[PDB]
Amino acid sequence: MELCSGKPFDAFTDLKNGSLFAFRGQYSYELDEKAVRPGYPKLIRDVWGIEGPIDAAFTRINSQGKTYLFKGSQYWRFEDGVLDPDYPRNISDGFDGIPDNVDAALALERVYFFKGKQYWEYQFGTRQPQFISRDWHGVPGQVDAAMAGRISVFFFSGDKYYRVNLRTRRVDTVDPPYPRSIAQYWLGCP
Ligand SMILES: [Cl-]
Ligand code: NA
Ligand code: NA
Numbered sequence: 624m625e626l627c628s629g630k631p632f633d634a635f636t637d638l639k640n641g642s643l644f645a646f647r648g649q650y651s652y653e654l655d656e657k658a659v660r661p662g663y664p665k666l667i668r669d670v671w672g673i674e675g676p677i678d679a680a681f682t683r684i685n686s687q688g689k690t691y692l693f694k695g696s697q698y699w700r701f702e703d704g705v706l707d708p709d710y711p712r713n714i715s716d717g718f719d720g721i722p723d724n725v726d727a728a729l730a731l732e733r734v735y736f737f738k739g740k741q742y743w744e745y746q747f748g749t750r751q752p753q754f755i756s757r758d759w760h761g762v763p764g765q766v767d768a769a770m771a772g773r774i775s776v777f778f779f780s781g782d783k784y785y786r787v788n789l790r791t792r793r794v795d796t797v798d799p800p801y802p803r804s805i806a807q808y809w810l811g812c813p
Pocket of ligand 3: 634635636637679680681727728729730768769770771
């Protein structure tokens with residue numbers, strides 16, 4: 624289906640360079656103001672060389688800007704358009720302490736994995752899990768995808784999303800308020 628169908632998403636990543644990718648079922652959506660065809664539905668198998676649906680994605684903030692895609696117990700690492708050699712790997716081999724079948728991830732060098740009501744911090748070692756709702760104020764303990772900007776993170780749940788200020792770690796006050804339509808207020812779909 625197309626970007627503006629209103630259906631929930633499976634994953635997002637901000638490449639931290641002006642471009643980002645959304646994932647839903649078998650489809651990958653490149654979202655960049657520089658794109659000749661922004662939001663053109665392409666097959667994940669065609670762009671990333673793997674079968675959808677994926678569970679989570681993130682892109683590291685460092686120089687190399689590697690993209691990580693998660694599905695089940697496995698992850699794939701990409702750079703410069705291409706799957707790195709020695710991928711896929713088991714999550715346990717790259718991310719000790721992080722569970723399988725995650726719901727979401729984001730990168731600020733701190734990475735956060737989300738699964739049910741809990742999240743895990745990873746630094747390039749893992750800690751005890753904490754509660755999403757305790758540390759991300761106004762975010763319920765159920766997220767489908769996440770992505771990190773410069774001053775905000777976004778949490779996606781069904782057909783709606785939340786924006787959280789990174790300083791306050793609280794959902795921002797806007798009008799109409801969060802949670803609100805991904806299609807209408809985040810993608811700027813008709
Ligand atoms: Cl995600
Ligand atoms: Na997800
Ligand atoms: Na993400």
